[PDB]
Design a protein around this ligand. Structure first.
Ligand SMILES: CC(=O)N[C@H](C(=O)N1C[C@H](O)C[C@H]1C(=O)NCc1ccc(-c2scnc2C)cc1)C(C)(C)C
Ligand SMILES: [Fe+2]
Lengths: 104, 185, 96, 148
């Protein structure tokens, strides 16, 4: 069973997938393969809650109907400065113009 | 016997027959039975509704007679109806229908009486008027539809519906699902 | 295997390469002689597609890649009305 | 006309299965090749219907005439019931292009009288007005079969 995620930090967002039965550490492993930072220099969040390295994604809340290809779930990412960690920061996307009245 | 080669031929013949001074309902029925149903020749009038049967007008017949095709789903059926003193012919194009004939009501409400009950096999053509009684037609099949060819002379928009339990009347005005092959909502 | 798509407002979107080739114009860019030489960075700037629609576009990418060979049922791709007009312009440009 | 049902008169029971989120309109192609519609199927519903070997079907959104797939092709022809088992026709969404999916959506929200009041390049006004139609698709499909 596959979940579909956007891993987000600052203005960088990653589109990737994983199995509901794969763990958070395993997810840092592939974030390592993309932005080249080891999992010990990474923090992963679901909204505001830091995620345990050994908890499986299904156990953190990412499941079949919560993280779908056409509507992926969001995973926050924070790196280590080199002493300790930065604050979790994610810039939102832009906003669409207000709906034309011709479309009700 | 005059054997209609096509459905159009049968329609050309009927127009001639109803142009004469006297209509012989034995000869009309015989010639309608004679036409061997060919779906390529009437498929355009075969339109189905999931919930009820459909009335599909084909020819309004120079004001002297109506020609319709009715389309019966699985389990679809008429109500107990009269024919407003007009001749009525029914020919099977596809499937079967069970005709159940009822006698008219005694005046105080009571369950009407089944006089007879018969099945109409394909290409068979029946005749009914108010002189023989009132009927109700249903498609008994659980798996296949029914398609029938109706001729009513004079044409009528009106007739009466009968509660089998009481016999009291409610008179209806009949819709048309299509006219000449075109949907009419 | 991954390529970086950059929006007009500077949002970076890293998606799988074979996902991005869902776009006919991206496939034209990167499958022929426009392929990134290794001395280059795997970045494509879309300087007129804002981030709220570009993010939507990669959602379609994963959707299409996931359900193209599904054989019994697929969901509908949802489009909010506010982004519908802007999304339709990005799809016409991206040819997908 | 090449896309026509053949008058086989050999019956063939069929299961129509709508596993789309749309209201499906079954469309039969008569012996002259003209389309005739049939009762609509709500989402999630299945019905066992009466048909014949060699008859041509296709399936559309009953409200927008968007095209639908049936066993992952757009045309459906039943064979003969081998051993009296039914034939299954599985109606699904296709994976629309993003463009055709947005055009579906904004046709859903703005009346055609007002397409050209939208600030989009006029290349897309004509695209909006090119409403999905089944004889335009028949056009394509017959000329797809001529080129074997
Ligand atoms: C001998 C022949 O080919 N007959 C045709 C015929 O019976 N057909 C044509 C197609 O094969 C389907 C078949 C038919 O009309 N079947 C009855 C039917 C009624 C409702 C439905 C549906 S579709 C969705 N819900 C329902 C209930 C499907 C078929 C007609 C009578 C239309 C010329
Ligand atoms: Fe009658």
């Amino acid at each position: 069973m596959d979940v579909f995620l956007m891993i987000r930090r600052h203005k960088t967002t990653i589109f990737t997938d994983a199995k509901e039965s794969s763990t958070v550490f395993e997810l840092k492993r592939i974030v390592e393969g993309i932005l080249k930072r080891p999992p010990d220099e990474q923090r992963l969040y679901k909204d505001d809650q830091l995620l345990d390295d050994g908890k499986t994604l299904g156990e953190c809340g990412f499941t079949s109907q919560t993280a779908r290809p056409q509507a992926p779930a969001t995973v926050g990412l924070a790196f280590r400065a080199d002493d300790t960690f930065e604050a979790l920061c994610i810039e939102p996307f832009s906003s669409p113009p207000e709906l034309p009245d011709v479309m009700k | 016997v005059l054997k209609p080669r096509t459905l159009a031929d049968l329609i050309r013949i009927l127009h001639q027959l109803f142009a004469g001074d006297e209509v012989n309902v034995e000869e009309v029925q015989a010639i309608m039975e004679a036409y061997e149903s060919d779906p390529t020749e009437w498929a355009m009038y075969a339109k189905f509704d999931q919930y009820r049967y459909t009335r599909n007008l084909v020819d309004q017949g120079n004001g002297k007679f109506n020609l319709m095709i009715l389309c019966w789903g699985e389990g679809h059926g008429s109500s107990i109806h009269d024919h407003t003193n007009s001749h009525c012919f029914l020919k099977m194009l596809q499937g079967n229908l069970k005709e159940t004939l009822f006698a008219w009501p005694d005046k105080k409400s009571n369950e009407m009486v089944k006089k007879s009950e018969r099945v109409l096999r394909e290409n068979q053509c029946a005749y009914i008027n108010d002189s023989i009684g009132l009927h109700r037609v249903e498609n008994i099949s659980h798996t296949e539809p029914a398609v029938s060819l109706h001729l009513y002379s004079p044409p009528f928009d009106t007739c009466h519906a009968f509660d089998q339990r009481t016999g009291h009347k409610n008179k209806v005005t009949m819709t048309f699902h299509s006219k000449f092959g075109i949907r009419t909502p | 295997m991954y390529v970086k798509l950059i929006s007009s407002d500077g949002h970076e979107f890293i998606v799988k390469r074979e996902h991005a080739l869902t776009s006919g114009t991206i496939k034209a860019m990167l499958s022929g002689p426009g392929q990134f030489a290794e001395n280059e960075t795997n970045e494509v700037n879309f300087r007129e597609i804002p981030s709220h629609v570009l993010s939507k576009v990669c959602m379609y990418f994963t959707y299409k890649v996931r359900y193209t060979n599904s054989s019994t049922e697929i969901p509908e791709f949802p489009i909010a009305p506010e982004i519908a007009l802007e999304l339709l312009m990005a799809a016409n440009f991206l040819d997908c | 006309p090449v896309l026509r049902s053949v008058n086989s008169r050999e019956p063939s029971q069929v299961i129509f299965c709508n596993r789309s989120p749309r209201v499906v309109l079954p469309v039969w192609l008569n012996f002259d090749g003209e389309p005739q519609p049939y009762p609509t199927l709500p989402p999630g519903t299945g019905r066992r219907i009466h048909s014949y070997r060699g008859h041509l079907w296709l399936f559309r959104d009953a409200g927008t005439h968007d095209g639908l797939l049936v066993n992952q092709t757009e045309l459906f022809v039943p064979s003969l019931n081998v051993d009296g088992q039914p034939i299954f026709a599985n109606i699904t969404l296709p994976v629309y292009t993003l463009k055709e999916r947005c055009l579906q959506v904004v046709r859903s929200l703005v009346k055609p009288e007002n397409y050209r009041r939208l600030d989009i390049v006029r290349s897309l006004y004509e695209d909006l007005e090119d409403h999905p139609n089944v004889q335009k698709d028949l056009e394509r499909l017959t000329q797809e079969r001529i080129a074997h």
